[PDB]
Amino acid sequence: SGYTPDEKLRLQQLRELRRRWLKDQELSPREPVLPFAVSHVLIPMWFVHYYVKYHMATKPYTIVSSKPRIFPGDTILETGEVIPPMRDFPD
Amino acid sequence: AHLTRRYLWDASVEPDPEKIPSFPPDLGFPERKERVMVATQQEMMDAQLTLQQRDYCAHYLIRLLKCKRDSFPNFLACKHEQHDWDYCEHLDYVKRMKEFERERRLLQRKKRRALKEARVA
Amino acid sequence: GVHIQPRYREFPQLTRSQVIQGEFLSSLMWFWILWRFWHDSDAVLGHFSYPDPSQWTDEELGIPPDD
Amino acid sequence: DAPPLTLDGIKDRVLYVLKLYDKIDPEKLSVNSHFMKDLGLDSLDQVEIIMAMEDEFGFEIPDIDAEKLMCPQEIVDYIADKKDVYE
Amino acid sequence: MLCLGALTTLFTAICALTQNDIKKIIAFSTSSQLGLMMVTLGMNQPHLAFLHICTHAFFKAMLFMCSGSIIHSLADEQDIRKMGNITKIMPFTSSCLVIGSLALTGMPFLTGFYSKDLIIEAINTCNTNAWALLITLIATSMTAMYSMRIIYFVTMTKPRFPPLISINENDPDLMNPIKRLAFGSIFAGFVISYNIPPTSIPVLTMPWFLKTTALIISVLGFLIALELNNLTMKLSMNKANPYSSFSTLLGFFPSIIHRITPMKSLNLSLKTSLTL
Amino acid sequence: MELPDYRQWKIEGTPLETVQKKLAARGLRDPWARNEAWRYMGGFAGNITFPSVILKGFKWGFAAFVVAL
Amino acid sequence: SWDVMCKHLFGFVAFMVFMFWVGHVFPSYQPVGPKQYPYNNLYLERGGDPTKEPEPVVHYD
Amino acid sequence: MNIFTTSILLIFILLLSPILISMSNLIKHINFPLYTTTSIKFSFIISLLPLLMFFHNNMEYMITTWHWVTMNSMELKMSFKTDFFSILFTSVALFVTWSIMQFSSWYMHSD
Amino acid sequence: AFCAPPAYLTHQQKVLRLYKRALRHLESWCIHRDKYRYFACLMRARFEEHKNEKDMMRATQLLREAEEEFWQNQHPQPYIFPDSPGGTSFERYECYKVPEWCLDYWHPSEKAMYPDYFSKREQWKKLRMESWDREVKQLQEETSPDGIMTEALPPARREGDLPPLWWHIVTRPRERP
Amino acid sequence: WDKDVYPEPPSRTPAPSPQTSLPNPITYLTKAYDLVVDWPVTLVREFIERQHAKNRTYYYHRQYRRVPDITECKEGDVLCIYEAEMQWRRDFKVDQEIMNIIQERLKACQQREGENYQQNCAKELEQFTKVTKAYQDRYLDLGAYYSARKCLAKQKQRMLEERKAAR
Amino acid sequence: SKYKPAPLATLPSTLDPAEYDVSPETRRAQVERLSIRARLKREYLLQYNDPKRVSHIEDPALIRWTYARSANIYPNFRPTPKNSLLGAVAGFGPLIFWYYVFKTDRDRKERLIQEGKLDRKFNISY
Ligand SMILES: [Zn+2]
């Protein structure tokens, strides 16, 4: 085949114009003429705490927790009791 | 391979997993003593052991968990406690294997004895 | 061309850091695999030996004397 | 990431590849030199050439427009026009 | 779910073996691993299933961004076919890729190993579908295979990328995160397993073949994949077997169930429910 | 950006040469080989073995292990 | 070809579904007897009624 | 231990902070990719604090922050559980997210 | 994409467009370059023979059995380039290819900056309106003599004139902004 | 909150028993939280409440006298019945927040007693049926047009049954 | 084997006999159709590329489509069989199906509630 001698000129010429358009698209110098964790960690934190220790905590059943784990022989701080030591492991 | 025996060659000799103690404990065992649970039903309930984990090894577990809360920053030091628990359990898996083998054999007893009585008459 | 320049039909030149960081991550992988294998070799073996279910004296299981 | 092409860097690669095709003499390849009437290659060798270029520059020349990349230059502006190189 | 998790594991893994898109292969691996995760939930082992979720996140994230590095560094080539010898051209990602690949294949003492083999041996020890048990294990060997497919084609082969080469991974924003996750991929399984609360009462007592099955199947999975890949370069043309098609075009679920349903669901609205 | 001399590339010394010799028995000769030469030509010339990738860094890794041990 | 597709896909589906059935028929289960839980199979803790004691389920050595 | 509750509520507030910065005109002036990457980084550290708590003590927490509707018998409320599944996953997810945002800045550069 | 589609296809373009589909679908089965550069010069042989068949009937009987050999020996996942139709990046960047007639509704503030840009844009728009007449007339004076019309457009053929209908092949959204 | 309407069990906590030389990373942090997060806040809060106590005001809880119920209310007398459908629609809610509390009191008793919920938390669930079997027996079949006349009938359809079955 | 076009997965261009047709007529249509499309193409391309235009290019081929599809339907309706049988199975068929699906369920439910079996436990809402 091969380009037709009258299509290798409509691509000859239109490519020449595309090259000028893209040159014109180029921006001149000056073209664009225009005319610290404490910040998000600490400040947000104080607020949250304010909320969690003075609303949630205060209201009923808002922050509930699985009972603490108590094993044999470990003391209960609040009541003072000492969990009996378990039956001796024979083996 | 137990399966190959049960599914390929024989059907009665091999026992069914759904009913492992197909036979009463007394058989071939005069006054066999039952397993003894060391931990207190309360001890477990206070150590918040998951129901499943309340095995006959619950007692060595509570120990592990003890040494895991204590020794907190160090998660690599309650190692003897884990061996123990595991052992207790390996020593339980083995039991559960001994019970299965005992059943197996006992059911065989039935077969062989069936023939024993099947003696020509 | 910025940073490292391109290489037409040639082995791209490599920066000191690219090679060292790459050997670093891989070598730590191998140090960790070797360190744990030595300290804790129960990945393949297992620390509990399977019992041979076929060596349990019939007394052990309650297999009554046939008859 | 990589640097953009140029109308003389898209021409040195196109001549480079072709100079490595054994049939095309490397001393009679000139950009204004037609593949089939001046260099001697057949029709099947145009497909093979274009394909090399499609693999040197990493894109596919549409057949309907690839059926005509005859001059060893049409290839150099078509590739560039398709890639927006205004030099 | 044990059953469907099992079918997806192999179905997705088999599809991954022939896929030629790097991102696609990793995605299929995302689905398979979750198929294994579905299997453990199906065998009522919830805690370990969660353990794999965490370990799965570290390595799969690595491999994707690893390929992100390869795709961006190359001229946006997303096909393993044109990408080769990244190991010498880009050791930093290749090192990260193999670290991730071995974690995916459950290399001993890496994050996959702490959680994955627990799941494997769980299967080998529970009462389960025989078909599910067999497919999950070969699914594990395939995970090694496609893992092998990626490194052989992407990393250990003569380069086949386009001729101009412009590769840079020096940017801190590439390395740093890849470096940070790599540290997680190397040490996370160690840390998470010891720290979590004792749960599930695992069965560590097994015949040794079952205890080491995950390790061996993974090893021969790569072994078998290696050989086939090598045989490929022998000037002996090898075309597809009947199944290769059912493997490369995703089991044909996409070709058939995506053209019939959207066609017979829209035809009925326009032609029947709307106009009639 | 200059470009390496086209002449530099040659098929001998690379796997293309063995493909070149057989195609030749058949009488055929592929003309585009030289283009596909830089793949095997240099830098990327060394064969990469699968153990080499899996074992990258093992040498120091074990060296590090011994010391720590 | 489309037919080839429809048949193959569904064949796979069926074979699988079937094999899964062959499976349920012949399951894989280790040589292990049943697990043994303490008390009365944790009757009370499984939430059983505290007042009504259950038929003891004992486990021997 | 409020330190626990506050931490679980705080991760959400810290991560929401990038979202409203883009709502206001402020993001044009600071760098959004760098700022977002840092805050997820801080969220991961904040997530670590409950994770250590759980491990030390293995205890959970149901947090009912805000009520939305009584709807008669079925009251609806916004509740975050802090069971082992939730906090373990929260830490793993943010680490991956912290990794990806930095990767995102390199990958989508020029977008 | 640029040149216009021919009405019917010749014998050649059908054969020579298989040589592409074939060789390119042979690099999806044969990935390694060597195996390929081998298994492919063997392909040409297939096309090289049966090149001089003068018996059209035969030729169109080798072609019709070639494209069925090929259809059944094709790769399901071939190697299609990244940016070509069916590819992985096809039309990816099109979300950024705005059509350029949109800078005409910009607020006088926006266009205030970027000043020289619009000084050159107003030149080009003068070029476009300055020739529509000579163009359309050309397009017409050179119309077909009541014959087959193709989608081909004429070149300029006179100085100062701009190729007829050139405003959208030129001034077209950049490929990868 | 009324420790008695929203109960809450006494707390039992195992005492600190460290067995490691390493320093707990939690205790140190808290020591900070207590200084850099709590003290700062604590200070502000108080200052809030003293601002409140200066002009302390009060708000009471409307107590509604009890009017005559539909059971006793002339037929057709829209006045009396209107005052008596409200007295019920009012107790349709007071009898609904009660059920809201049992929905809640329970939820807590299964978060506070995990892994024991099966047992320890059965003081409530016995109540959640002692209260649900009642709410079901006085307010459930009714349409969206719930009215005291219809509860009067929902009941009285069944008072036959507690009289036909008995007989 | 041989590709087998189905209403979906149609016969490709290649593998299609008519493509391999070079009868004078076919090459007379194939060149007579480009003309229609070239003609239409050169009626879109010098009206869209027209400076000095603000009006909306209409694409009347799309306006003939919508009119054909929502305003030329009932003027071309003739009630036949295969149209009214099929025009009643579609409107009343499922509408009668679900009635015996919902009646039977609602009746099963009611019976069970009446006899005292339905648990309706912890259901305090509806
Ligand atoms: Zn970039």
Side-chain angles (χ1 to χ4, degrees):
Chain A
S1 51
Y3 274 126
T4 303
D6 85 333
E7 166 63 356
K8 196 185 300 187
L9 190 58
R10 193 181 180 271
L11 295 174
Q12 189 65 260
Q13 289 166 338
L14 295 174
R15 295 182 183 174
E16 184 178 2
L17 289 157
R18 185 80 208 275
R19 307 307 189 58
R20 287 156 48 179
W21 183 255
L22 295 174
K23 184 68 180 295
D24 289 345
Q25 295 295 100
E26 183 178 2
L27 293 180
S28 298
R30 109 182 187 270
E31 216 56 18
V33 182
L34 295 174
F36 197 52
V38 292
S39 205
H40 47 90
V41 179
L42 190 56
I43 292 302
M45 258 200 302
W46 277 309
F47 282 102
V48 173
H49 192 274
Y50 175 77
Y51 184 69
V52 175
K53 179 196 173 55
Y54 295 145
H55 298 285
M56 293 190 181
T58 65
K59 299 176 185 60
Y61 302 133
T62 42
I63 320 287
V64 51
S65 68
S66 164
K67 289 288 190 175
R69 296 210 161 190
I70 46 187
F71 310 102
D74 180 65
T75 311
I76 299 178
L77 288 182
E78 313 203 13
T79 306
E81 172 189 3
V82 283
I83 299 307
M86 58 197 314
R87 180 198 326 178
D88 287 5
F89 304 74
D91 181 32
Chain B
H2 290 239
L3 294 70
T4 66
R5 320 192 183 100
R6 186 160 170 267
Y7 302 110
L8 288 55
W9 328 121
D10 292 345
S12 297
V13 296
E14 259 64 18
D16 295 352
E18 311 301 337
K19 331 165 186 177
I20 298 306
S22 60
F23 291 116
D26 50 355
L27 276 60
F29 272 138
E31 312 171 8
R32 186 208 312 181
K33 301 184 178 183
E34 36 204 8
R35 321 262 309 274
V36 175
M37 168 64 64
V38 175
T40 298
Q41 199 156 1
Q42 170 74 352
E43 203 81 54
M44 303 181 182
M45 176 170 311
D46 295 7
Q48 312 280 54
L49 302 166
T50 290
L51 295 174
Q52 163 193 7
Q53 304 178 18
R54 303 166 189 257
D55 75 309
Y56 277 90
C57 294
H59 61 263
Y60 280 123
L61 183 48
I62 300 180
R63 273 193 179 183
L64 179 70
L65 291 151
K66 188 165 188 177
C67 173
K68 268 197 169 178
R69 185 191 100 280
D70 306 340
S71 90
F72 170 65
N74 186 340
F75 58 104
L76 298 171
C78 295
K79 281 284 184 175
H80 179 88
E81 306 300 344
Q82 201 152 25
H83 178 96
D84 294 7
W85 177 39
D86 299 1
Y87 193 47
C88 171
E89 303 195 335
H90 156 78
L91 299 191
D92 173 28
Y93 196 76
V94 60
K95 308 300 296 181
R96 300 174 56 197
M97 290 180 49
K98 281 164 31 149
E99 289 146 25
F100 175 79
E101 197 33 69
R102 146 209 182 88
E103 174 181 9
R104 164 189 278 182
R105 306 192 182 186
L106 295 187
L107 274 302
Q108 287 176 346
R109 205 175 72 95
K110 293 302 165 292
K111 164 180 168 299
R112 58 181 61 98
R113 297 199 312 167
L115 180 277
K116 171 68 173 185
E117 181 278 342
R119 188 160 186 175
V120 291
Chain C
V2 173
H3 294 83
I4 316 173
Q5 308 177 180
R7 305 284 298 273
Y8 184 80
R9 305 200 187 190
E10 302 283 12
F11 177 79
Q13 184 65 260
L14 295 196
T15 58
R16 278 294 74 183
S17 185
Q18 187 173 355
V19 175
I20 294 169
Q21 294 300 320
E23 293 177 350
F24 178 80
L25 281 178
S26 295
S27 295
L28 177 63
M29 177 178 73
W30 278 103
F31 167 71
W32 198 62
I33 290 179
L34 283 153
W35 197 74
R36 188 53 56 185
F37 185 84
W38 179 265
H39 290 247
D40 203 17
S41 185
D42 287 336
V44 176
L45 180 59
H47 37 280
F48 299 128
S49 53
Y50 196 62
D52 181 342
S54 185
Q55 315 307 323
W56 289 330
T57 63
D58 310 357
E59 335 307 323
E60 175 179 346
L61 313 187
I63 317 301
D66 305 347
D67 305 1
Chain D
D1 181 22
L5 296 174
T6 42
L7 286 174
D8 57 356
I10 193 174
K11 188 183 61 61
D12 295 357
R13 300 170 65 178
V14 168
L15 265 50
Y16 200 69
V17 171
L18 310 186
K19 287 163 53 180
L20 300 184
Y21 176 77
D22 289 21
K23 293 179 179 179
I24 295 169
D25 167 69
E27 302 193 3
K28 292 173 53 181
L29 171 58
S30 301
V31 300
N32 45 14
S33 303
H34 290 78
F35 286 156
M36 295 179 54
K37 291 185 306 180
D38 197 0
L39 288 179
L41 306 197
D42 51 34
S43 42
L44 295 174
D45 290 320
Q46 202 271 354
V47 174
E48 294 192 17
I49 286 179
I50 289 321
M51 283 186 301
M53 318 281 78
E54 296 180 350
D55 201 2
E56 172 83 21
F57 293 88
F59 69 113
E60 184 173 352
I61 305 302
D63 303 9
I64 187 52
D65 295 7
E67 290 175 357
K68 327 172 186 302
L69 294 198
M70 298 300 293
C71 300
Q73 165 94 8
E74 321 288 357
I75 311 187
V76 174
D77 288 345
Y78 181 79
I79 305 301
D81 182 65
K82 181 66 170 301
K83 296 300 184 181
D84 298 330
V85 182
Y86 64 89
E87 186 65 10
Chain E
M1 68 193 88
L2 188 147
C3 297
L4 294 174
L7 176 63
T8 189
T9 299
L10 183 67
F11 180 87
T12 61
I14 294 169
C15 291
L17 296 190
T18 59
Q19 303 288 326
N20 289 284
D21 193 283
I22 171 173
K23 267 230 302 196
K24 298 292 180 65
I25 300 154
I26 306 173
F28 274 107
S29 174
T30 301
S31 202
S32 186
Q33 289 321 106
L34 295 174
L36 188 147
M37 258 160 265
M38 191 66 148
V39 160
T40 189
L41 261 169
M43 183 176 282
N44 186 340
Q45 268 287 126
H47 283 294
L48 274 66
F50 183 68
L51 295 174
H52 181 197
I53 285 178
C54 318
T55 59
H56 159 263
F58 284 88
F59 58 88
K60 295 292 180 65
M62 178 153 57
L63 274 66
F64 270 116
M65 293 183 284
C66 285
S67 64
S69 178
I70 307 158
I71 289 157
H72 199 90
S73 69
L74 279 195
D76 289 345
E77 186 44 62
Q78 186 173 355
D79 290 345
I80 74 192
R81 271 187 290 254
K82 301 301 290 187
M83 307 189 292
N85 187 340
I86 294 169
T87 43
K88 294 180 182 297
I89 62 100
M90 293 183 284
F92 177 82
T93 188
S94 64
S95 70
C96 295
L97 188 147
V98 62
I99 282 160
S101 296
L102 295 174
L104 171 60
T105 61
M107 181 67 181
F109 309 110
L110 296 174
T111 58
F113 162 81
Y114 297 94
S115 168
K116 183 178 179 180
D117 65 9
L118 289 182
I119 303 301
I120 288 314
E121 72 193 17
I123 324 179
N124 306 141
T125 311
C126 175
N127 195 9
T128 319
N129 289 284
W131 179 255
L133 177 63
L134 63 80
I135 65 197
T136 45
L137 275 66
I138 61 171
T140 299
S141 64
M142 291 181 178
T143 59
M145 294 189 178
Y146 62 89
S147 179
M148 179 67 181
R149 185 176 179 83
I150 294 169
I151 60 171
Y152 165 84
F153 294 122
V154 177
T155 59
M156 66 174 282
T157 300
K158 297 292 184 289
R160 308 178 301 275
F161 59 88
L164 176 63
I165 294 169
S166 64
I167 305 290
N168 187 340
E169 63 185 342
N170 301 348
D171 189 339
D173 297 352
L174 179 69
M175 290 173 173
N176 295 167
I178 295 169
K179 184 190 183 69
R180 244 199 298 115
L181 177 63
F183 285 146
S185 187
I186 294 152
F187 293 114
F190 181 80
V191 176
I192 299 167
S193 55
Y194 297 137
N195 271 283
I196 66 168
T199 41
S200 304
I201 181 183
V203 171
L204 188 147
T205 300
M206 293 177 72
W208 57 273
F209 59 88
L210 295 174
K211 169 72 210 66
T212 63
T213 189
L215 295 174
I216 62 100
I217 190 66
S218 66
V219 164
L220 62 80
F222 267 101
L223 276 193
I224 295 157
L226 170 52
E227 200 63 28
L228 181 277
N229 289 337
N230 289 337
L231 166 70
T232 298
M233 196 185 300
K234 292 195 56 179
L235 292 182
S236 295
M237 178 57 174
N238 289 284
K239 288 193 180 62
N241 304 6
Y243 54 88
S244 304
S245 186
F246 193 92
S247 295
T248 189
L249 304 174
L250 300 76
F252 297 161
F253 177 80
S255 294
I256 195 172
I257 209 65
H258 281 206
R259 284 182 152 107
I260 184 57
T261 305
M263 175 181 187
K264 270 181 170 48
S265 55
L266 275 66
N267 160 72
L268 295 174
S269 294
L270 177 63
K271 190 180 68 65
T272 299
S273 177
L274 188 147
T275 58
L276 188 147
Chain F
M1 187 183 66
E2 322 304 339
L3 299 184
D5 179 6
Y6 73 101
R7 306 174 186 85
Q8 159 199 8
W9 318 112
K10 307 184 185 307
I11 186 167
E12 52 199 357
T14 59
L16 295 174
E17 171 93 349
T18 59
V19 158
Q20 184 65 260
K21 267 144 30 179
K22 290 174 65 175
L23 269 175
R26 292 177 64 84
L28 311 193
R29 181 179 180 274
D30 57 332
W32 286 103
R34 302 170 60 246
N35 207 11
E36 294 177 350
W38 58 273
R39 311 207 174 277
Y40 297 96
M41 188 67 181
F44 318 90
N47 193 231
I48 316 288
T49 190
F50 171 64
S52 178
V53 175
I54 303 301
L55 297 174
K56 175 205 193 358
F58 175 78
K59 297 292 184 289
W60 302 92
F62 176 80
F65 168 63
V66 176
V67 175
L69 197 51
Chain G
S1 297
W2 179 261
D3 301 15
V4 176
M5 212 153 297
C6 173
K7 302 180 302 181
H8 285 205
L9 169 69
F10 297 138
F12 163 91
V13 163
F15 163 80
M16 294 300 289
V17 168
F18 163 73
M19 273 294 189
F20 273 96
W21 167 86
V22 167
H24 272 114
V25 176
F26 306 123
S28 81
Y29 67 105
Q30 295 300 320
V32 283
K35 191 170 186 56
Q36 304 177 351
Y37 285 142
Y39 306 111
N40 315 277
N41 218 54
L42 302 165
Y43 160 75
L44 275 66
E45 293 177 350
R46 205 161 312 281
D49 172 26
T51 79
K52 193 46 171 295
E53 299 71 15
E55 44 177 347
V57 180
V58 296
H59 313 276
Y60 285 100
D61 296 352
Chain H
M1 268 149 298
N2 295 168
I3 320 85
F4 185 95
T5 304
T6 54
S7 178
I8 298 294
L9 188 147
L10 179 75
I11 61 171
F12 281 100
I13 315 289
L14 274 185
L15 295 174
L16 295 174
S17 308
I19 308 295
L20 62 80
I21 186 167
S22 64
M23 283 190 171
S24 176
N25 187 340
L26 202 50
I27 62 100
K28 186 200 306 186
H29 297 66
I30 61 100
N31 192 31
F32 202 44
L34 203 36
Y35 156 74
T36 310
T37 301
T38 62
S39 63
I40 294 169
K41 185 200 306 186
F42 293 116
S43 301
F44 169 60
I45 308 159
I46 303 301
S47 187
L48 279 182
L49 188 147
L51 193 49
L52 295 174
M53 283 207 49
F54 185 70
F55 287 158
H56 170 233
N57 288 342
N58 280 166
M59 182 177 46
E60 292 82 352
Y61 281 66
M62 162 199 196
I63 307 154
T64 300
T65 301
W66 193 74
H67 178 187
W68 197 27
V69 204
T70 299
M71 299 283 186
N72 290 337
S73 64
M74 176 154 313
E75 182 178 2
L76 177 63
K77 323 195 69 180
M78 183 187 313
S79 314
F80 305 91
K81 194 166 196 178
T82 75
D83 186 27
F84 152 74
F85 302 125
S86 178
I87 60 171
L88 177 63
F89 187 74
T90 299
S91 314
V92 177
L94 295 174
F95 190 76
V96 171
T97 313
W98 177 18
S99 180
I100 302 301
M101 296 296 180
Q102 200 167 0
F103 174 64
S104 298
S105 82
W106 178 78
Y107 193 85
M108 304 303 299
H109 166 272
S110 275
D111 184 89
Chain I
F2 296 78
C3 304
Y8 51 86
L9 287 169
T10 75
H11 185 260
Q12 163 187 346
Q13 306 187 173
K14 287 192 266 190
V15 170
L16 282 181
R17 282 186 192 186
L18 181 67
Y19 193 71
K20 187 194 192 73
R21 293 152 38 186
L23 295 174
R24 290 283 186 181
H25 265 253
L26 177 63
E27 76 168 7
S28 310
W29 281 113
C30 296
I31 302 95
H32 301 286
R33 301 305 299 178
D34 50 347
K35 185 174 177 291
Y36 161 70
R37 186 41 55 184
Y38 164 81
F39 277 110
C41 199
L42 290 178
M43 169 81 52
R44 154 178 288 267
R46 310 190 54 180
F47 286 71
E48 184 65 13
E49 168 198 1
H50 298 143
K51 183 180 182 177
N52 292 172
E53 196 72 4
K54 314 307 189 309
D55 186 1
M56 286 302 90
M57 293 298 304
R58 179 60 178 163
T60 62
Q61 183 65 260
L62 277 161
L63 178 63
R64 298 178 80 268
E65 293 177 350
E67 293 177 350
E68 182 178 2
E69 183 178 2
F70 161 68
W71 197 259
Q72 92 185 0
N73 298 130
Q74 79 172 284
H75 201 282
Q77 293 177 335
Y79 185 66
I80 59 177
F81 292 85
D83 223 342
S84 65
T88 76
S89 305
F90 189 44
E91 289 181 345
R92 161 185 291 177
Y93 295 96
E94 309 269 336
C95 55
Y96 320 121
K97 312 218 277 70
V98 297
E100 183 268 329
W101 44 254
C102 203
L103 295 174
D104 285 1
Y105 273 105
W106 270 30
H107 190 296
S109 169
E110 297 165 326
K111 44 216 313 180
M113 57 190 51
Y114 295 89
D116 319 316
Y117 179 77
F118 293 73
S119 179
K120 296 176 265 173
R121 185 176 179 83
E122 184 65 13
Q123 299 180 355
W124 262 122
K125 283 191 314 193
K126 183 180 68 65
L127 295 174
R128 194 213 186 166
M129 292 177 182
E130 183 178 2
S131 64
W132 178 247
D133 318 295
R134 291 193 297 274
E135 63 185 342
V136 297
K137 181 193 313 175
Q138 183 65 260
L139 177 63
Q140 183 180 356
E141 183 178 2
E142 185 193 314
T143 188
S144 71
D146 192 9
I148 300 82
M149 198 165 176
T150 58
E151 306 191 7
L153 299 184
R157 305 185 188 283
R158 174 182 303 180
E159 67 275 10
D161 181 65
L162 300 168
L165 276 42
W166 62 278
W167 188 255
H168 295 92
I169 295 100
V170 185
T171 82
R172 65 171 186 264
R174 190 181 310 101
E175 194 184 28
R176 201 177 323 272
Chain J
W1 49 287
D2 184 336
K3 298 292 184 289
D4 295 345
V5 309
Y6 291 119
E8 170 184 0
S11 172
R12 289 206 309 177
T13 303
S17 64
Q19 307 172 4
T20 295
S21 176
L22 301 168
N24 182 32
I26 293 300
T27 182
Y28 294 167
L29 273 45
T30 64
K31 297 189 197 64
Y33 199 77
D34 294 358
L35 277 43
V36 67
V37 176
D38 210 346
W39 169 272
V41 168
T42 305
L43 294 187
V44 174
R45 175 59 185 184
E46 298 291 1
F47 181 75
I48 300 298
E49 293 179 354
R50 71 181 71 184
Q51 298 300 320
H52 297 169
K54 290 177 182 178
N55 58 357
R56 179 65 67 190
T57 59
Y58 294 97
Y59 69 96
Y60 301 101
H61 172 99
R62 184 169 207 91
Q63 295 169 168
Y64 289 100
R65 160 190 317 173
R66 302 294 285 179
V67 295
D69 49 356
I70 191 66
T71 56
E72 163 200 16
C73 188
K74 185 61 67 66
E75 183 178 2
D77 188 359
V78 294
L79 298 174
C80 162
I81 192 174
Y82 176 77
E83 286 205 10
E85 292 293 330
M86 295 297 103
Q87 191 202 348
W88 183 73
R89 292 177 64 84
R90 183 178 296 122
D91 289 345
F92 180 72
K93 297 183 71 68
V94 172
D95 293 332
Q96 198 76 47
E97 295 293 329
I98 294 165
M99 183 66 75
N100 187 340
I101 294 165
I102 309 299
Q103 292 280 327
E104 171 178 344
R105 190 179 299 181
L106 177 68
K107 287 177 184 57
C109 175
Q110 189 268 344
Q111 176 74 345
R112 186 192 296 100
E113 299 287 0
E115 306 294 355
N116 302 3
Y117 88 89
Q118 306 275 3
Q119 166 178 342
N120 292 180
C121 204
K123 174 60 171 301
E124 289 78 3
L125 177 63
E126 182 64 24
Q127 190 171 179
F128 184 68
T129 67
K130 185 66 68 175
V131 179
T132 303
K133 182 65 171 66
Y135 185 86
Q136 284 182 353
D137 281 334
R138 59 191 285 173
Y139 290 158
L140 188 147
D141 288 345
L142 305 171
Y145 294 141
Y146 52 84
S147 66
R149 289 183 291 110
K150 294 176 71 65
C151 182
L152 177 63
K154 184 185 193 301
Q155 184 182 5
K156 194 185 287 179
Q157 185 183 3
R158 183 181 69 208
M159 294 178 75
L160 299 171
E161 294 177 350
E162 295 177 350
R163 182 177 65 83
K164 177 181 58 178
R167 280 181 302 188
Chain K
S1 298
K2 182 164 299 180
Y3 189 43
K4 185 175 178 298
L8 304 176
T10 61
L11 196 52
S13 175
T14 69
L15 295 174
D16 180 18
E19 188 186 32
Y20 321 104
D21 174 3
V22 296
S23 49
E25 183 277 351
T26 298
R27 325 282 281 184
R28 197 198 66 261
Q30 292 171 323
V31 188
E32 180 176 351
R33 300 201 195 96
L34 177 58
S35 308
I36 300 181
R37 59 186 276 99
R39 183 171 301 94
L40 295 174
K41 187 86 169 190
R42 180 182 293 176
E43 210 194 315
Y44 175 74
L45 284 192
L46 41 48
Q47 171 196 7
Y48 162 100
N49 286 348
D50 178 32
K52 296 178 283 284
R53 174 195 56 86
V54 294
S55 309
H56 199 105
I57 311 295
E58 298 180 11
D59 194 356
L62 189 68
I63 298 165
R64 292 191 295 267
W65 182 60
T66 61
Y67 184 83
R69 181 177 181 170
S70 299
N72 186 340
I73 300 298
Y74 185 74
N76 292 322
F77 177 57
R78 151 177 51 96
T80 64
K82 184 185 193 301
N83 194 358
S84 66
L85 189 147
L86 176 63
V89 172
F92 297 164
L95 183 59
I96 293 164
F97 182 76
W98 291 102
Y99 183 74
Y100 294 165
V101 176
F102 288 163
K103 183 169 71 172
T104 49
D105 192 36
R106 289 227 72 220
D107 288 350
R108 181 177 65 83
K109 184 169 71 172
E110 295 302 320
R111 156 180 50 181
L112 290 192
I113 291 159
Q114 296 295 100
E115 183 280 335
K117 189 170 184 179
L118 196 49
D119 218 354
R120 318 195 76 183
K121 190 172 66 285
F122 307 135
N123 185 21
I124 57 185
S125 305
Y126 55 113

